[PDB]
Amino acid sequence: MNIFEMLRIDEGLRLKIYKDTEGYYTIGIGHLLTKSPSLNAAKEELDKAIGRNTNGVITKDEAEKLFNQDVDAAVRGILRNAKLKPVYDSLDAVRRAALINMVFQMGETGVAGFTNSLRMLQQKRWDEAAVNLAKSRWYNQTPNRAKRVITTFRTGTWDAYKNL
Template sequence: MSETTRRRRTKAVRLLLGVGAATVAATVLATTPALAGGTPPPPPPGKPTDPPDPGPCGPMKTMRDMDMREIKEMIARHESPNGLAGDPHVYRDSRGIPTVGIGFNLNRADAAAALAAVGANYADVLAGRADLTQLQTTLLFEQAMAEAYSAAYRLVPGFDNLSMSRQAVVLDMIFNLGPTGVAQFQNMLAAINRGDFEAAANEMASSAWKTQVGTRATHDIAIMRRGGVCDPKPLPVPPPPVSPDIPGIPVNPVRYPNDVTTIQPSSPPDTTGGGGGVGHMKCNFTRIEVYYENHWVGFLDIYCA
């Protein structure tokens, strides 16, 4: 190969190398935005975003308030494994107290008079020789509810300002402990009266009552803390016919087993912003209407003034 040919080939190789380097550089710049002056790629994903707060009832559930019917059903479930049906035959509760119906204490001082008022013989019921009818069980429970409301107004002056769910908690504790027992929860009552329901729930949770009662207390504490319930609203109860003594369509009827239904007057809607409203039972109403076996059988006088 001549010297001239060698020089020509060397020059051609150098030109090809120069074109290749330029092509590589252009490719790198084009495929690397940061080097080409473009927008850098996003950083690698970090910790995933926290899910939205599911609220006090958890996901897919909504908190709501209770109504009068649900309050009675809740207390009845806590008082008797048979709920609103109650226990027609006398039994001894966990403390050895003779009990009948929906948690009715046969050792209370006025037990004989209370049973006589509903047509039952105290001695026979206590001895197990006679059982209560569903109507008698219902009447005893409704009277006990009225008495619990009376005690609640004494213990919590602002009782009407509470949600009905929190009212249910106070009433349930009165059924469980009696007014005297609930009065011992001075810090809890003070917290309720000032509207500090978290503190009230904490007082309940730290008490010996919580340990002794168990599930019932846990349920009450959760409702006191939340101010409502998370369960779906139960299907409405068809109202009985219009009562001869209470005008209009009955509001919030409570359907007991064996065709016993009770209704009661509700306090008028509150116009002062202080609470109350339809469904709240007030002790200035003195009767509860009773519908049994397709006819009105009279009314229950409420002694809770």
């Protein structure tokens, strides 16, 4: 169980364009095409990314490729981040995956917002950061995924991902 297998469970895999909980055009393993409302504008982004004329359809392969580049960018995102880096450095390996999971999902900006729970993570206050994490819109939008992530920061194990 590692960051890739966790993210796969949470985002799933979709070969055709889709919209996320916020109304954004996404594809593959949670890959965000763009924030612009146009389906054409998104389909352009997809082609410029996959490099070929897809018609908003891709293969398992091209989705796996976006996934690798997305995990990688999430990681360098935490490391270039002055709010995020020190919390990351301060965490263990499992917990570290939890934070990449979040940045993958809502971006460095979205996650740096979480000041109070980030502060609590950097202080090892497992229990209090979880409550804080649950007190949020993220939780309400994506509650089962949020639960898994939260528990991961809680317990430090992959339990949420191994049990029903």
